[PDB]
mmCIF file with all atom_site columns, C-alpha atoms in Angstrom:
data_model
loop_
_atom_site.group_PDB
_atom_site.id
_atom_site.type_symbol
_atom_site.label_atom_id
_atom_site.label_alt_id
_atom_site.label_comp_id
_atom_site.label_asym_id
_atom_site.label_entity_id
_atom_site.label_seq_id
_atom_site.pdbx_PDB_ins_code
_atom_site.Cartn_x
_atom_site.Cartn_y
_atom_site.Cartn_z
_atom_site.occupancy
_atom_site.B_iso_or_equiv
_atom_site.pdbx_formal_charge
_atom_site.auth_seq_id
_atom_site.auth_comp_id
_atom_site.auth_asym_id
_atom_site.auth_atom_id
_atom_site.pdbx_PDB_model_num
ATOM 1   C CA . UNK A 1 1  ? 92.406 86.220 103.735 1.00 52.60 ? 2  UNK A CA 1
ATOM 2   C CA . UNK A 1 2  ? 90.060 84.952 105.916 1.00 54.42 ? 3  UNK A CA 1
ATOM 3   C CA . UNK A 1 3  ? 87.787 84.707 101.928 1.00 55.30 ? 4  UNK A CA 1
ATOM 4   C CA . UNK A 1 4  ? 90.661 82.457 101.382 1.00 55.33 ? 5  UNK A CA 1
ATOM 5   C CA . UNK A 1 5  ? 88.420 80.364 105.058 1.00 51.88 ? 6  UNK A CA 1
ATOM 6   C CA . UNK A 1 6  ? 85.644 80.519 102.342 1.00 47.83 ? 7  UNK A CA 1
ATOM 7   C CA . UNK A 1 7  ? 87.189 79.776 98.820  1.00 47.00 ? 8  UNK A CA 1
ATOM 8   C CA . UNK A 1 8  ? 89.483 76.715 100.562 1.00 49.86 ? 9  UNK A CA 1
ATOM 9   C CA . UNK A 1 9  ? 86.619 75.649 103.286 1.00 51.22 ? 10 UNK A CA 1
ATOM 10  C CA . UNK A 1 10 ? 84.204 75.826 98.976  1.00 50.95 ? 11 UNK A CA 1
ATOM 11  C CA . UNK A 1 11 ? 86.433 73.373 98.072  1.00 50.76 ? 12 UNK A CA 1
ATOM 12  C CA . UNK A 1 12 ? 85.560 70.630 101.516 1.00 47.65 ? 13 UNK A CA 1
ATOM 13  C CA . UNK A 1 13 ? 81.843 71.021 100.756 1.00 45.93 ? 14 UNK A CA 1
ATOM 14  C CA . UNK A 1 14 ? 83.022 70.363 97.258  1.00 44.07 ? 15 UNK A CA 1
ATOM 15  C CA . UNK A 1 15 ? 85.878 67.252 97.377  1.00 44.03 ? 16 UNK A CA 1
ATOM 16  C CA . UNK A 1 16 ? 84.026 65.953 100.437 1.00 42.25 ? 17 UNK A CA 1
ATOM 17  C CA . UNK A 1 17 ? 80.725 65.576 97.285  1.00 48.81 ? 18 UNK A CA 1
ATOM 18  C CA . UNK A 1 18 ? 83.026 64.459 94.942  1.00 49.22 ? 19 UNK A CA 1
ATOM 19  C CA . UNK A 1 19 ? 83.009 61.844 99.426  1.00 44.62 ? 20 UNK A CA 1
ATOM 20  C CA . UNK A 1 20 ? 79.103 61.860 99.305  1.00 42.59 ? 21 UNK A CA 1
ATOM 21  C CA . UNK A 1 21 ? 79.160 61.020 94.756  1.00 43.17 ? 22 UNK A CA 1
ATOM 22  C CA . UNK A 1 22 ? 81.756 58.081 94.896  1.00 42.72 ? 23 UNK A CA 1
ATOM 23  C CA . UNK A 1 23 ? 81.027 56.631 98.212  1.00 44.56 ? 24 UNK A CA 1
ATOM 24  C CA . UNK A 1 24 ? 77.010 56.708 96.705  1.00 42.99 ? 25 UNK A CA 1
ATOM 25  C CA . UNK A 1 25 ? 78.801 54.896 93.417  1.00 46.18 ? 26 UNK A CA 1
ATOM 26  C CA . UNK A 1 26 ? 80.983 52.609 96.937  1.00 48.18 ? 27 UNK A CA 1
ATOM 27  C CA . UNK A 1 27 ? 77.431 51.646 97.658  1.00 46.18 ? 28 UNK A CA 1
ATOM 28  C CA . UNK A 1 28 ? 75.239 51.026 94.361  1.00 44.03 ? 29 UNK A CA 1
ATOM 29  C CA . UNK A 1 29 ? 78.440 48.622 93.029  1.00 46.43 ? 30 UNK A CA 1
ATOM 30  C CA . UNK A 1 30 ? 78.972 46.857 95.989  1.00 50.08 ? 31 UNK A CA 1
ATOM 31  C CA . UNK A 1 31 ? 74.302 46.262 95.440  1.00 50.28 ? 32 UNK A CA 1
ATOM 32  C CA . UNK A 1 32 ? 75.630 44.168 92.758  1.00 50.35 ? 33 UNK A CA 1
ATOM 33  C CA . UNK A 1 33 ? 77.396 41.467 95.573  1.00 50.61 ? 34 UNK A CA 1
ATOM 34  C CA . UNK B 2 1  ? 80.026 40.564 102.460 1.00 51.71 ? 2  UNK B CA 1
ATOM 35  C CA . UNK B 2 2  ? 79.791 43.201 99.329  1.00 50.51 ? 3  UNK B CA 1
ATOM 36  C CA . UNK B 2 3  ? 75.484 44.386 101.979 1.00 53.91 ? 4  UNK B CA 1
ATOM 37  C CA . UNK B 2 4  ? 78.593 45.127 104.223 1.00 55.00 ? 5  UNK B CA 1
ATOM 38  C CA . UNK B 2 5  ? 80.506 47.283 100.544 1.00 52.07 ? 6  UNK B CA 1
ATOM 39  C CA . UNK B 2 6  ? 76.188 48.905 101.272 1.00 52.57 ? 7  UNK B CA 1
ATOM 40  C CA . UNK B 2 7  ? 76.520 49.488 104.887 1.00 53.38 ? 8  UNK B CA 1
ATOM 41  C CA . UNK B 2 8  ? 80.415 50.608 104.932 1.00 52.30 ? 9  UNK B CA 1
ATOM 42  C CA . UNK B 2 9  ? 80.403 52.967 101.366 1.00 51.34 ? 10 UNK B CA 1
ATOM 43  C CA . UNK B 2 10 ? 76.954 54.658 103.480 1.00 50.67 ? 11 UNK B CA 1
ATOM 44  C CA . UNK B 2 11 ? 78.352 54.673 106.776 1.00 52.80 ? 12 UNK B CA 1
ATOM 45  C CA . UNK B 2 12 ? 81.217 56.877 103.006 1.00 52.01 ? 13 UNK B CA 1
ATOM 46  C CA . UNK B 2 13 ? 77.715 58.797 102.463 1.00 54.22 ? 14 UNK B CA 1
ATOM 47  C CA . UNK B 2 14 ? 77.145 59.748 105.921 1.00 54.29 ? 15 UNK B CA 1
ATOM 48  C CA . UNK B 2 15 ? 80.642 61.135 106.731 1.00 55.72 ? 16 UNK B CA 1
ATOM 49  C CA . UNK B 2 16 ? 81.310 62.194 103.876 1.00 55.87 ? 17 UNK B CA 1
ATOM 50  C CA . UNK B 2 17 ? 76.687 64.501 104.556 1.00 55.59 ? 18 UNK B CA 1
ATOM 51  C CA . UNK B 2 18 ? 79.026 65.793 107.695 1.00 54.67 ? 19 UNK B CA 1
ATOM 52  C CA . UNK B 2 19 ? 82.669 66.886 105.316 1.00 56.04 ? 20 UNK B CA 1
ATOM 53  C CA . UNK B 2 20 ? 80.019 69.385 103.487 1.00 56.23 ? 21 UNK B CA 1
ATOM 54  C CA . UNK B 2 21 ? 78.373 70.115 106.363 1.00 57.40 ? 22 UNK B CA 1
ATOM 55  C CA . UNK B 2 22 ? 81.291 71.068 108.724 1.00 57.08 ? 23 UNK B CA 1
ATOM 56  C CA . UNK B 2 23 ? 83.403 72.106 105.801 1.00 57.95 ? 24 UNK B CA 1
ATOM 57  C CA . UNK B 2 24 ? 79.247 74.653 105.232 1.00 56.41 ? 25 UNK B CA 1
ATOM 58  C CA . UNK B 2 25 ? 80.146 76.006 108.333 1.00 51.78 ? 26 UNK B CA 1
ATOM 59  C CA . UNK B 2 26 ? 84.223 76.227 107.335 1.00 52.57 ? 27 UNK B CA 1
ATOM 60  C CA . UNK B 2 27 ? 82.534 78.672 105.101 1.00 51.07 ? 28 UNK B CA 1
ATOM 61  C CA . UNK B 2 28 ? 80.218 80.027 107.337 1.00 52.25 ? 29 UNK B CA 1
ATOM 62  C CA . UNK B 2 29 ? 82.800 81.025 109.927 1.00 51.52 ? 30 UNK B CA 1
ATOM 63  C CA . UNK B 2 30 ? 85.498 82.126 108.378 1.00 50.22 ? 31 UNK B CA 1
ATOM 64  C CA . UNK B 2 31 ? 82.644 84.679 106.441 1.00 51.24 ? 32 UNK B CA 1
ATOM 65  C CA . UNK B 2 32 ? 82.089 85.477 109.912 1.00 52.15 ? 33 UNK B CA 1
ATOM 66  C CA . UNK B 2 33 ? 86.745 87.255 108.719 1.00 54.47 ? 34 UNK B CA 1
ATOM 67  C CA . UNK C 3 1  ? 87.645 45.105 88.662  1.00 55.67 ? 2  UNK C CA 1
ATOM 68  C CA . UNK C 3 2  ? 88.007 44.178 92.784  1.00 55.14 ? 3  UNK C CA 1
ATOM 69  C CA . UNK C 3 3  ? 92.357 45.692 90.893  1.00 57.23 ? 4  UNK C CA 1
ATOM 70  C CA . UNK C 3 4  ? 90.166 48.613 90.082  1.00 56.45 ? 5  UNK C CA 1
ATOM 71  C CA . UNK C 3 5  ? 89.517 48.414 94.020  1.00 55.70 ? 6  UNK C CA 1
ATOM 72  C CA . UNK C 3 6  ? 92.308 48.558 94.840  1.00 57.27 ? 7  UNK C CA 1
ATOM 73  C CA . UNK C 3 7  ? 92.689 51.792 92.534  1.00 55.30 ? 8  UNK C CA 1
ATOM 74  C CA . UNK C 3 8  ? 90.536 53.520 93.672  1.00 55.65 ? 9  UNK C CA 1
ATOM 75  C CA . UNK C 3 9  ? 90.507 52.660 97.922  1.00 54.75 ? 10 UNK C CA 1
ATOM 76  C CA . UNK C 3 10 ? 94.892 54.402 96.520  1.00 53.40 ? 11 UNK C CA 1
ATOM 77  C CA . UNK C 3 11 ? 93.088 56.889 95.223  1.00 49.26 ? 12 UNK C CA 1
ATOM 78  C CA . UNK C 3 12 ? 91.165 56.582 99.045  1.00 47.88 ? 13 UNK C CA 1
ATOM 79  C CA . UNK C 3 13 ? 94.803 56.679 100.397 1.00 49.99 ? 14 UNK C CA 1
ATOM 80  C CA . UNK C 3 14 ? 96.023 59.012 98.369  1.00 47.40 ? 15 UNK C CA 1
ATOM 81  C CA . UNK C 3 15 ? 93.272 61.983 98.661  1.00 48.33 ? 16 UNK C CA 1
ATOM 82  C CA . UNK C 3 16 ? 92.249 61.073 102.973 1.00 44.66 ? 17 UNK C CA 1
ATOM 83  C CA . UNK C 3 17 ? 96.726 62.139 102.774 1.00 45.82 ? 18 UNK C CA 1
ATOM 84  C CA . UNK C 3 18 ? 96.121 65.344 101.612 1.00 45.53 ? 19 UNK C CA 1
ATOM 85  C CA . UNK C 3 19 ? 93.131 65.766 104.326 1.00 45.92 ? 20 UNK C CA 1
ATOM 86  C CA . UNK C 3 20 ? 95.916 64.853 106.791 1.00 45.64 ? 21 UNK C CA 1
ATOM 87  C CA . UNK C 3 21 ? 98.067 67.556 104.964 1.00 44.63 ? 22 UNK C CA 1
ATOM 88  C CA . UNK C 3 22 ? 95.612 70.013 104.274 1.00 44.96 ? 23 UNK C CA 1
ATOM 89  C CA . UNK C 3 23 ? 93.248 69.279 107.689 1.00 44.90 ? 24 UNK C CA 1
ATOM 90  C CA . UNK C 3 24 ? 98.179 69.780 108.914 1.00 48.59 ? 25 UNK C CA 1
ATOM 91  C CA . UNK C 3 25 ? 98.344 73.157 107.407 1.00 47.43 ? 26 UNK C CA 1
ATOM 92  C CA . UNK C 3 26 ? 94.464 74.221 109.179 1.00 45.43 ? 27 UNK C CA 1
ATOM 93  C CA . UNK C 3 27 ? 96.400 73.591 112.531 1.00 45.84 ? 28 UNK C CA 1
ATOM 94  C CA . UNK C 3 28 ? 99.480 75.627 111.791 1.00 46.37 ? 29 UNK C CA 1
ATOM 95  C CA . UNK C 3 29 ? 97.283 78.717 109.959 1.00 49.16 ? 30 UNK C CA 1
ATOM 96  C CA . UNK C 3 30 ? 94.703 78.350 112.487 1.00 49.24 ? 31 UNK C CA 1
ATOM 97  C CA . UNK C 3 31 ? 98.452 78.518 114.774 1.00 49.22 ? 32 UNK C CA 1
ATOM 98  C CA . UNK C 3 32 ? 99.233 81.853 113.261 1.00 51.21 ? 33 UNK C CA 1
ATOM 99  C CA . UNK C 3 33 ? 94.798 82.890 115.527 1.00 50.59 ? 34 UNK C CA 1
ATOM 100 C CA . UNK D 4 1  ? 88.238 80.393 118.791 1.00 51.52 ? 2  UNK D CA 1
ATOM 101 C CA . UNK D 4 2  ? 91.397 80.544 116.707 1.00 48.75 ? 3  UNK D CA 1
ATOM 102 C CA . UNK D 4 3  ? 92.455 77.280 119.264 1.00 49.03 ? 4  UNK D CA 1
ATOM 103 C CA . UNK D 4 4  ? 89.108 76.168 118.408 1.00 47.89 ? 5  UNK D CA 1
ATOM 104 C CA . UNK D 4 5  ? 90.864 76.057 114.425 1.00 48.44 ? 6  UNK D CA 1
ATOM 105 C CA . UNK D 4 6  ? 93.352 73.632 116.318 1.00 48.66 ? 7  UNK D CA 1
ATOM 106 C CA . UNK D 4 7  ? 91.159 71.328 117.981 1.00 46.79 ? 8  UNK D CA 1
ATOM 107 C CA . UNK D 4 8  ? 89.094 71.313 115.018 1.00 50.57 ? 9  UNK D CA 1
ATOM 108 C CA . UNK D 4 9  ? 91.404 71.181 111.969 1.00 48.59 ? 10 UNK D CA 1
ATOM 109 C CA . UNK D 4 10 ? 93.532 67.835 114.794 1.00 49.24 ? 11 UNK D CA 1
ATOM 110 C CA . UNK D 4 11 ? 90.057 66.402 114.253 1.00 49.15 ? 12 UNK D CA 1
ATOM 111 C CA . UNK D 4 12 ? 91.015 67.071 110.086 1.00 48.90 ? 13 UNK D CA 1
ATOM 112 C CA . UNK D 4 13 ? 94.023 65.270 110.986 1.00 51.23 ? 14 UNK D CA 1
ATOM 113 C CA . UNK D 4 14 ? 92.234 62.009 113.077 1.00 52.71 ? 15 UNK D CA 1
ATOM 114 C CA . UNK D 4 15 ? 88.951 61.596 111.225 1.00 55.69 ? 16 UNK D CA 1
ATOM 115 C CA . UNK D 4 16 ? 90.835 61.712 107.836 1.00 56.77 ? 17 UNK D CA 1
ATOM 116 C CA . UNK D 4 17 ? 93.791 59.073 109.642 1.00 58.32 ? 18 UNK D CA 1
ATOM 117 C CA . UNK D 4 18 ? 90.772 56.886 109.940 1.00 58.22 ? 19 UNK D CA 1
ATOM 118 C CA . UNK D 4 19 ? 90.293 57.868 105.669 1.00 59.74 ? 20 UNK D CA 1
ATOM 119 C CA . UNK D 4 20 ? 94.302 56.467 105.164 1.00 57.78 ? 21 UNK D CA 1
ATOM 120 C CA . UNK D 4 21 ? 93.029 53.189 107.407 1.00 61.70 ? 22 UNK D CA 1
ATOM 121 C CA . UNK D 4 22 ? 89.549 52.194 106.757 1.00 63.85 ? 23 UNK D CA 1
ATOM 122 C CA . UNK D 4 23 ? 90.554 53.218 102.779 1.00 61.33 ? 24 UNK D CA 1
ATOM 123 C CA . UNK D 4 24 ? 93.847 50.537 103.330 1.00 65.08 ? 25 UNK D CA 1
ATOM 124 C CA . UNK D 4 25 ? 91.843 48.730 105.246 1.00 65.76 ? 26 UNK D CA 1
ATOM 125 C CA . UNK D 4 26 ? 89.168 49.309 101.203 1.00 67.65 ? 27 UNK D CA 1
ATOM 126 C CA . UNK D 4 27 ? 92.997 48.471 99.735  1.00 69.18 ? 28 UNK D CA 1
ATOM 127 C CA . UNK D 4 28 ? 93.272 45.471 101.162 1.00 68.36 ? 29 UNK D CA 1
ATOM 128 C CA . UNK D 4 29 ? 89.754 43.178 100.961 1.00 68.62 ? 30 UNK D CA 1
ATOM 129 C CA . UNK D 4 30 ? 89.295 44.345 97.593  1.00 70.81 ? 31 UNK D CA 1
ATOM 130 C CA . UNK D 4 31 ? 93.213 42.351 97.266  1.00 72.61 ? 32 UNK D CA 1
ATOM 131 C CA . UNK D 4 32 ? 91.497 39.341 98.404  1.00 69.74 ? 33 UNK D CA 1
ATOM 132 C CA . UNK D 4 33 ? 89.088 39.319 93.875  1.00 73.00 ? 34 UNK D CA 1
#
């Protein structure tokens, strides 16, 4: 279903947030070199 | 260099933002099914 | 630990494989428009 | 266009390859801790 477009491309947003968050937590730790 | 940890894991942030935006724009286009 | 660099930047590989697969399966479904 | 699906979701494959490659090159460098 072009809805299951929406759900899959939220699950994009959400894992590509969890990208943002791990790759901040990349920055901070590689702050602590 | 653990600065170049920082920059690479920023370039993490910027692209995994651009993940979020394009996979928003995913949700929007695939809301326009 | 710079082992836990290794594991995290494997968990990089495994998810950015699973990127490739799902964004294949993107191409296949969006070839089935 | 549900083709521009294909092109965008190749550009998925390709940047989420360039994920795979940077996050191998993550592993190797964080091999060299």
